[PDB]
Design a protein around this ligand. Sequence first.
Ligand SMILES: CC1=C(/C=C/C(C)=C\C=C\C(C)=C\C=C\C=C(C)\C=C\C=C(C)\C=C\C2=C(C)CCCC2(C)C)C(C)(C)CCC1
Lengths: 32, 32, 160, 160, 286, 286, 29, 29, 32, 32, 213, 213, 161, 161, 37, 37
Amino acid sequence: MTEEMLYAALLSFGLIFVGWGLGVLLLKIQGA
Amino acid sequence: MTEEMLYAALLSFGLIFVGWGLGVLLLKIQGA
Amino acid sequence: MATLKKPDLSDPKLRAKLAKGMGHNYYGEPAWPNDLLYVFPVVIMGTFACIVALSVLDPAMVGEPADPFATPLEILPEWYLYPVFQILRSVPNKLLGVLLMASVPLGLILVPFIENVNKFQNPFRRPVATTIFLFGTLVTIWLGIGATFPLDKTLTLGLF
Amino acid sequence: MATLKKPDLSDPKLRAKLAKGMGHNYYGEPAWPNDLLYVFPVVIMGTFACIVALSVLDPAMVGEPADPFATPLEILPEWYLYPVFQILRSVPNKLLGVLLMASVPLGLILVPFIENVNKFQNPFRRPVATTIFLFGTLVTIWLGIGATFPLDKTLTLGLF
Amino acid sequence: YPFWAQQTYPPTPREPTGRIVCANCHLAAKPAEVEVPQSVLPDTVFKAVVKIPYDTKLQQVAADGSKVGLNVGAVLMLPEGFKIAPEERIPEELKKEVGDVYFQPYKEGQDNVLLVGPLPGEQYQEIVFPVLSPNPTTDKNIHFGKYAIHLGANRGRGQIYPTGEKSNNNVFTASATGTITKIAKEEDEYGNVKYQVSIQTDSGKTVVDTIPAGPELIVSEGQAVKAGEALTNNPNVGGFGQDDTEIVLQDPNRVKWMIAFICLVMLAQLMLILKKKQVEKVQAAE
Amino acid sequence: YPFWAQQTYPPTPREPTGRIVCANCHLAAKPAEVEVPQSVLPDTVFKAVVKIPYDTKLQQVAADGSKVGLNVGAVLMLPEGFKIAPEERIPEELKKEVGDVYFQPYKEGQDNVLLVGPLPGEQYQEIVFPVLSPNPTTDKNIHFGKYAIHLGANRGRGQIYPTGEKSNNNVFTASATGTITKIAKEEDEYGNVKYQVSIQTDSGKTVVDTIPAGPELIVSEGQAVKAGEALTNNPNVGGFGQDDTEIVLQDPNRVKWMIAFICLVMLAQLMLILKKKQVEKVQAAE
Amino acid sequence: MEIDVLGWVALLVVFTWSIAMVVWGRNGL
Amino acid sequence: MEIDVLGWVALLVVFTWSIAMVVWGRNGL
Amino acid sequence: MILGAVFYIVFIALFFGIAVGIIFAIKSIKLI
Amino acid sequence: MILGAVFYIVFIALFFGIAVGIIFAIKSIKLI
Amino acid sequence: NVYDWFQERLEIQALADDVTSKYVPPHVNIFYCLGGITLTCFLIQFATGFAMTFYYKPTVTEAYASVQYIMNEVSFGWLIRSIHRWSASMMVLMMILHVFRVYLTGGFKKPRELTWISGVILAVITVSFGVTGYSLPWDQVGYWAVKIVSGVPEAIPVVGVLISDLLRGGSSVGQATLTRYYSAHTFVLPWLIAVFMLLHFLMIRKQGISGPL
Amino acid sequence: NVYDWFQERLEIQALADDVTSKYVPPHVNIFYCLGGITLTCFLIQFATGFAMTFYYKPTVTEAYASVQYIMNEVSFGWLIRSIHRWSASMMVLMMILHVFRVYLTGGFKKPRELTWISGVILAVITVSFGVTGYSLPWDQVGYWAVKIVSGVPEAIPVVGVLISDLLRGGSSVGQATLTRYYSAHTFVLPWLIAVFMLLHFLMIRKQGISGPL
Amino acid sequence: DVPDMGRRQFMNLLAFGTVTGVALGALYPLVKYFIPPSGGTTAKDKLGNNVKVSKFLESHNAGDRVLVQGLKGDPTYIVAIRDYGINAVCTHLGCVVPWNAAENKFKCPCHGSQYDETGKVIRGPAPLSLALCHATVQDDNIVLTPWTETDFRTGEKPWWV
Amino acid sequence: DVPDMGRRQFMNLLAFGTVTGVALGALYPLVKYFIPPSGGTTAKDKLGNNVKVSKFLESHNAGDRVLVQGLKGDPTYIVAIRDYGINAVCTHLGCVVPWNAAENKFKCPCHGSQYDETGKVIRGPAPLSLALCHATVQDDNIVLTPWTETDFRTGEKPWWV
Amino acid sequence: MVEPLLDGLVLGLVFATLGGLFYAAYQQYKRPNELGG
Amino acid sequence: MVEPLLDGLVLGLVFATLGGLFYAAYQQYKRPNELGG
Ligand SMILES: CC1=C(/C=C/C(C)=C\C=C\C(C)=C\C=C\C=C(C)\C=C\C=C(C)\C=C\C2=C(C)CCCC2(C)C)C(C)(C)CCC1
């Protein structure tokens, strides 16, 4: 029950940065 | 039942002309 | 008098409108106050007052509980469905009736194209049209009233 | 690059806009194709796909038939109602609670006037504002979580 | 007879379909009418007119065979609350119109479902009902509004007796398929004529057909007709008829306030047009 | 005992309010937990863990007065269709975890409402349930979706016997208002101690108070206390606890198709952004 | 039983008076 | 009992991949 | 009917007259 | 978790690679 | 001030100007009202309709009785429902007179054939309102009207049935039918009519009224 | 052709031009999406909401059972309703994140304080959606949530009660309550939200996005 | 160094094709949703119950000619019980047709159609017989299943099959 | 020869005043419509029936402490029957409060309020006693009418009057 | 179920309208145009 | 009735958003303006 809340918070927060960085990287490798 | 239909037809039709003429007359008596 | 403004036929914009049949709210009596603010309310209030009057003098009825095992003997749709209903019941091939029904809206759609040949608005300057209209109107009223008769006496409207 | 167009600061119309704080969709990357037609769908499809995913992995439940004689022990409103609910239950004068609740929207309305004094958008250039915002945000989250505790242990959030 | 509806179908004369149980035995069909005012105020006596027209100068077969005039009867379902007006509240001119009509409720309580007749066709070609409109103010469970009235009027003798056996005011088909030999004609000295008939030869065959006097035959001797074909012509000249209509139990305050509002509306409309007139002026001065 | 719930409240252990009938006699309150997987596939054995924690190094009053360790019990309501897994379908490692637990249904049929204990508190501080998820494919009246699980776990001796009379693991108030004179202490050679007490003088007065051994007194002689005030301190160190949770009887095709659609979505998103990239070019060439 | 009649009449009167006021107001067809 | 896991993961993957595609597409914050 | 007719006339009548009445009333105190 | 992590990586991975893969694939047959 | 407050931001004035700049030409007579009366009728429907959604209960066990409740025990319920009834018929009628004025005025011809088409659609929608409302009291008349029309589409080959099952919630009229018709009447048709009323009127404001005769 | 057909009459081109002439400035980052995500959430609500009106039955005898019908026996009913549930919560959340971006961007200041005000109203409406939908299953949770909030307004002097009786259909929660809440949820609130969404967006298209930071 | 129309067109198709795919995928279950959930079924009376066959024969009319909430919801006549039921829905438009013992014919009141002891037409604008079906008698109630076996009344295929 | 502002203003007021009148007149019945139709009433059980007082005392718990669909819809406790009913609605927010025979107190579970044999508070954030009312016994059923006579329990005016 | 008043109402308005419509076309077909078309 | 996953989801997004928002104000409060304001 409570383990779910923490999983959900950590992941919703952090995965944003994964996608962010992934986007930025995709940008780096295309050149601009 | 059927007397109602005829009343209604005659009146819806004819009263239009009464109001029409009444309007036209109101116009005549105001001057324009 | 009323109050009136003539088409500024010196305005090329208005002319280019009129040319594509379309500058007619540029001239006449002004719509604001004159019409929108003074007589529109008269039409609305009037429309409301007639309905209220009818509603009070001849209020809504409540029928009997629906019974799925007992077909009413008397059983008509509302008045504006009479014609279609006449058609639907008095045409023995069912698909033909459905098609004839759909033809009313679909047909009615085609009209502006069909009648786009000439550019006449006035019904007198389009006798062929005005005739087919009056004919259709007549057949409609006829069919509607026919809905009101028993099926055998329906088409003859009981006279021949 | 992206694709970019600079403010035509030689256009008096754009200047008169900008002057009343308002010409900002005249320059930048073009919205058509670029944004509206290529990435908007990505945001929509993405938003839809996340909801679908959540809906399938954690589908809606069906509770027990409502019983007017049996109050649930567990009985909370949805999450976005927690704060207000904390306020409502934990304030013994009822009219005070109602008033405090209405104050949330009514208060929130006044904000743009209250904060209209200066013309700063950036939260750093309005430290007083940004502070009261963060304070309010905190009190909100706090109250919300408090809704989740038992009433006696609610305000202390169980620590003091 | 109206009193056979009650006997065979005690609870109500009207089936869920709207068809009245009279038709169950009076198999023919003639026009029937009801006339009530469009509206009645609460607690008022008004006229409700049933019409059962038919060719006055024409008689029908009596049970034995005679040729007597024919009589009328009717059931009239009015709305809950409505009842036949008390005699002392029927004004005189109405009382004259109504006659010696013995209005009788369909069952104890149903004072708004009234049975009428047998009554002499000659004079009760139409039938007045003095009826008294209920009052929502002294029967909280009677409401204003628009309600239905159903009529089921008849004239002429029926075709089935409450027992099941046919009467003689209908035609008598034929018992079997094939060749007939003898058209006899009894008359047991109490029960009149019986034009007897038989049919035979085909499958051995010998069977008989007794047929009560009253009708005319359009059959002759020796025919080779089928099983259940008209050998008797049709005597009936009466028949049953239905008619529905609506009446409005009207509250006068609904009407009085409506009229008020209408006046307010005509007044506002005036002021508006006059206001335009003022403006039509100012506008010329520009 | 779990088996007294069934005895006093046969149909179900749970009142419409959600409160479990245990509380009706175990008047104290300690934390209770359930753990089930978030989802289970149909027809699968999984773990469902009840936790009933308490201070292992602490004993409570026995009926006579001793000071023995304390035991745990529990009721666990799983969704319709769910049942304790068949022994031969419980893999070994699980079987080890479960122990000698005598899972018993609340009544004949309710195979998803399981009673447990008395069990020795020392080792059954948590309690494993091997449970088998139903299958919508071979029980057309069991559907996929999300369902509730309710827990009602206890530890320590109750306070009321199914008869009505109090136990000794609670405090004994006081019978009357006023002045006390004598704190005696019987011991009928079978039923142990009975620290007897009386209260008097005020309204004439003479009445007595027998109080079973087990608790400690924090009262002394001669007091002038009221009618129903704590004269016995509180022995209970157990208490009842509830916990609800949800489990998803998940159809794998829902998941497999969802994953498909997600992939289709990520694919479309790609193509869109790449398309923009192509356009970002053309646009530079203008 | 003729407040009933004023009733129907009032319907006929706004029907007539509305058309009248329309025509008058816009000098109308 | 781990198509279940791919299930949750796919949620996390479109959540991540959408943000990724947004940023990439608009060179973004 | 006959009573309906009479009422109708009279109903319109009053109002026509309130109209006409009110132009002038209004007009010849200089308002239209 | 650990299995969730692995799957996640790999899931993103395939797709990142389908992206990158497809720029070039597309690009160096002259399409971007 | 205020005009100023709003003018600074929203440009209220331009709004005022589009209004006070439309003119009505000599050929526009009284029948050019029929459209607006048809609309006035509908607004009346929307008001009274909405009002009745506060008492009417779309269930075969409850519908009929809720209607008699609104008639008998609700304050002015008899009025509100009598209006909905009458004004429903008046809308269809004024719409027809409106179609007359259009046709006998040639106002449906280039460049206004989309106004005419959206109008036909509006007419089909309005008839749909009528048919669905007709059945909501779940009385003898309404129930047998549905039981009759719902079967019409089965003649259409390939689909027919499927269409019919779709707008009756299965084989045969019953609760599902009433549920679906209620959705239709109070949710689907009000939104549709709003869209196509929107288009109708927009095209009209853009192209102005047709020319003279 | 076609562009021509439509261009001749309606001036489709001008439409195209207003679209292809709006530009997005450098300061507009990803959070400027939150508004559109909040909208996307709502369209999802409108679709799935409408869909459920084809099976859900707003009666104390029928409501709960119709919900379990949609869950269990309707094709993808479980999906459609799970989406309505989740996307309902997601709308409220994205709206909140949207309010964050506005405030921490000063985009609610002259000349956009009406956009901000209509936004607050939108937020109250959305919360109203949530509260009314919450009670439609007529289960234990939904029923006791209504029984609690409906009483709150009785503290307001003079009116309080009257207000409460108005939005519960009498003294005490019951059928009238469910009927009224159903009207609210599927008729009143969808229209209101549409109006104020309309105003929100119109003012926005007129004034364009706020300035840079 | 710039893609030609055909290459911009290729990318358009690749993208918007995939988008169309997602749309159809989402639109699919929504369509399936609106199609109502779905040989023959047990037969019920007015309240949609289930009829006790004992209380039926004991009390339901001299020479039974009786309405039952039969197959597909249709009210079917049920006349030891007879082999088959007569589907009472008139075949012209769709009114339920009353039995007439005083004439051994069914009569469609709406527009005048007539039938037999067996269904089967014989008059009126109604172009087909009243439909037949099996009426056996399981446990307590009656069970109805459709009549595939051809029309023992007309000859060739039944119009309902 | 042209009306001044004050005369244009007079005509505006005369007209739009009358229009406002018509509007209010139409708006009136619409408002009245939305206010729900409306001493005390007979008491019912779970299905909203009417309780037979005989089958009640025969079978409804040792030392009756029982819920009834009482006045104003409120569930009221009914404890030969006792003088008065105890209105079971908690007075803090509005949860129905359970009786506790094992303590002679009512307990509000939601946020912890407590009461008596008589209603009347004694603990918890609940600022008022449970409401009392008359419970006589007409013909077959029970009848409930409101308690105007002041609080035989507290002293001064009852908070409900 | 049928309601003449409504029916009679429909008819009188249908014929009065069709009439007045042709009357207006005529009245203009005949002193047409002016001010420019 | 409570549903953590939703709650944890709410929180992580609320803090990630508030964060990124201040990050964007900062990133601009600091290499601000250009191209004209
Ligand atoms: C109610 C209402 C209304 C109405 C509408 C309708 C529904 C209808 C109408 C309609 C009408 C309005 C009609 C009209 C018609 C008319 C006519 C039909 C005419 C006639 C003519 C003729 C036939 C000829 C003769 C002549 C003359 C008359 C003069 C000149 C000369 C001559 C000789 C030629 C309105 C809205 C408005 C308003 C309010 C409400």
